[PDB]
UniProtKB/Swiss-Prot annotation, chains A, B:
Subunit structure: Interacts with (and methylates) HIV-1 Tat, Rev and Nucleocapsid protein p7 (NC). Interacts with EPB41L3 and NCOA1.
Pfam entry (one): Methyltransf_25
GO MF term list: chromatin binding; histone arginine N-methyltransferase activity; histone binding; histone H2AR3 methyltransferase activity; histone H3R2 methyltransferase activity; histone H4R3 methyltransferase activity; histone methyltransferase activity; protein-arginine N-methyltransferase activity
Annotated Gene Ontology cellular component terms: nucleolus; nucleoplasm; nucleus
EC nos: 2.1.1.319
PTM comment: Automethylation enhances its stability.
PROSITE patterns: SAM_MT_PRMT
Species this chain originates from: Mus musculus (Mouse)
Listed name of the protein: Protein arginine N-methyltransferase 6
Cross-referenced InterPro entries: Arg_MeTrfase, Methyltransf_25, PRMT_dom, SAM-dependent_MTases_sf
Entry's family note: Belongs to the class I-like SAM-binding methyltransferase superfamily. Protein arginine N-methyltransferase family. PRMT6 subfamily.
Record domain SAM-dependent MTase PRMT-type: where: 1-325
Catalytic activity: L-arginyl-[protein] + 2 S-adenosyl-L-methionine = N(omega),N(omega)-dimethyl-L-arginyl-[protein] + 2 S-adenosyl-L-homocysteine + 2 H(+)
Gene: Prmt6
GO BP annotations listed: cellular senescence; DNA repair; methylation; negative regulation of DNA-templated transcription; negative regulation of transcription by RNA polymerase II; negative regulation of ubiquitin-dependent protein catabolic process; protein modification process; regulation of mitochondrion organization
Length: 325, 325
């Protein structure tokens, strides 16, 4: 028979094969063994069930693994195979309408999306916190931080400069194609998910927001926009292509464990969210860059990430660019 | 301003950055300098114009570069930048309805698609041959050959076996997910474009068709299906995942120059076209495999590639699988 689930298995494979992500959760959950031992846990968006199993292995007495997508059936099988059907219960459907037989001592979730908030489960985690978490209960991870840095994307630089190099390899001048490539690769307002490295970072990364997931008011902040101002000074001479946005989340130490998606840290499946200017801007050592960045819902869809960027490079006028996934 | 041409520049960049392809054309055209010198050329689907310029550099007196996509405007600029506006003429629109002021001595084209015939320009090249090529005129390349081999795709093997290895890395058994991954990754009827290497090839590749582009009847063969029978014997013990299809084209020697897309040869942007069985089949040294493969138009769209596969592995019954891009 033929099936249409290629994309489903690929997404879950990618996440479990992301050792930085999956080991951070394994260890972050285990670091909280004292708080989980003999207690009940809700896993929001449990996927294949692996995190729910990690919670049982950390000593949870009972775990409710809630998953709305088709993969919930595989999670139930995984739980059975690990001998945990008596303690880990897979419940299909969205957490907003699931019926648990009790409130829980902790919520665990891998809820983060590209750019932190694209197609994230954060609103579901917060809904579950309000509805099902006992007073004083634990959230894992507990917090998130957002970072921005100006970038000179070496891969993009190569793509833009490719056309001017055709002559040296094939004896045909194609340098005129550079303007075309620039318009096409940079003159749009889409957020681009791409992995960078430290070599691409043009100034010290700046933290522009911190989200304490248990804090009052966070749901309203998400609707109004999460963001802040930033300022920095460039390391050296390079074409500025725009900005990269990334995040980290923190698991309480029960030394806290941080799962980072920085280009300076080991690669993850989240990569970074890139915000390209319409064309490169030359900068030099100590060129000042300032601005404001805000992560917003889209009008049609609160889970489609919009980023509004205001930026000022050196003595140039401040500019605005409104991006979306 | 914002533009929507990211995909356009990416496709042309990929093709020109494919040195195996682009150098094969450069050299194949130059190898035919005696036949091109002082003569006229039609370039079918000229793209950015680079091949038309190669023809002028080989000594063509005049080149008509026909291109229907938006990129024709860039080609005109490239021609001007290389000082060739007097000799290379860019004509927008499909070659089927272009008006040339003369018949031509040669047609050059990079017309090949994935699996040779997916979204290929072959029918346009043949239409132009009939309408515009002088009797006795030259086609570059002159011929194509199609190959098939059984494969044990090492990357696929890793993806399928991933689930059974989760326990050894995270201490959670996910071996039950293997059946799910198999159905999802192999239990469909889509042709998959993927690059393999010699390590993936399970028996001697077999040539199953040869197309002489000037030959009478080729248009009718394309409609009825291009293909043939094959037989081979496996090198060793491995999971058979299916078959790979690839091609080469040949430029007359003016030693002919061959541009190959074999997994045993340097990588190209065409990769190979993979035809997966619904599930792996164990084979051993000297396991006989035979079958028939036919490349066909789709009902809705003659340029959407269909491949009909009949295959018999060892003593198993012959099976059929009908694939499409
Ligand atoms: Ca996730
Ligand atoms: Ca990348
Ligand atoms: Ca700050
Ligand atoms: Ca703020
Ligand atoms: Ca989407
Ligand atoms: Ca092509
Ligand atoms: Ca590949
Ligand atoms: Ca044959
Ligand atoms: Ca035949
Ligand atoms: Ca298509």
């Amino acid at each position: 028979l033929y099936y249409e689930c290629y994309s489903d298995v690929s997404v879950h494979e990618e996440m479990i094969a992301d050792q930085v992500r999956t080991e951070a959760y394994r260890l972050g959950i285990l670091k909280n063994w004292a708080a989980l031992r003999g207690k009940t846990v809700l896993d929001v968006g449990a996927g294949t069930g692996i995190l729910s199993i990690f919670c049982a292995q950390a000593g949870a007495r009972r775990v409710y693994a809630v998953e709305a997508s088709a993969i919930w059936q595989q999670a139930r099988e995984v739980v059975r195979l690990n001998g945990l059907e008596d303690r880990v219960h897979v419940l299909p459907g969205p957490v907003e309408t699931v019926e648990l037989p009790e409130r829980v001592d902790a919520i665990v979730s891998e809820w983060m999306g590209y750019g932190l908030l694209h197609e994230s489960m954060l609103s579901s985690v917060l809904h579950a916190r309000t509805k099902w978490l006992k007073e004083g209960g634990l959230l894992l991870p507990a917090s998130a931080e957002l970072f921005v840095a100006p970038i000179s994307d070496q891969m993009l630089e190569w793509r833009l400069g490719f056309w001017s190099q055709v002559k040296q390899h094939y004896g045909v001048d194609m340098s005129c194609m550079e303007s075309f490539a620039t318009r096409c690769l940079m003159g749009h307002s889409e957020i681009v998910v791409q992995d960078l490295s430290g070599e691409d970072v043009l100034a010290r990364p700046q933290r522009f927001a911190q989200l304490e997931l248990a804090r009052a008011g966070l749901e309203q902040e998400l609707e109004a926009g999460v963001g802040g101002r930033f300022r920095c000074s460039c390391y050296g001479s390079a074409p500025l292509h725009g900005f990269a946005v990334w995040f980290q989340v923190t698991f309480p130490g029960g030394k806290p464990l941080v799962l980072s998606t920085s280009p300076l840290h080991p690669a993850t499946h989240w990569k970074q969210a890139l915000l390209y200017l319409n064309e490169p801007v030359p900068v030099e050592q100590d060129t000042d860059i300032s601005g404001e960045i805000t992560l917003l819902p889209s009008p049609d869809n609160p889970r489609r990430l919009r980023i509004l960027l205001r930026y000022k490079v050196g003595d140039h006028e401040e500019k605005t660019k409104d991006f979306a996934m």
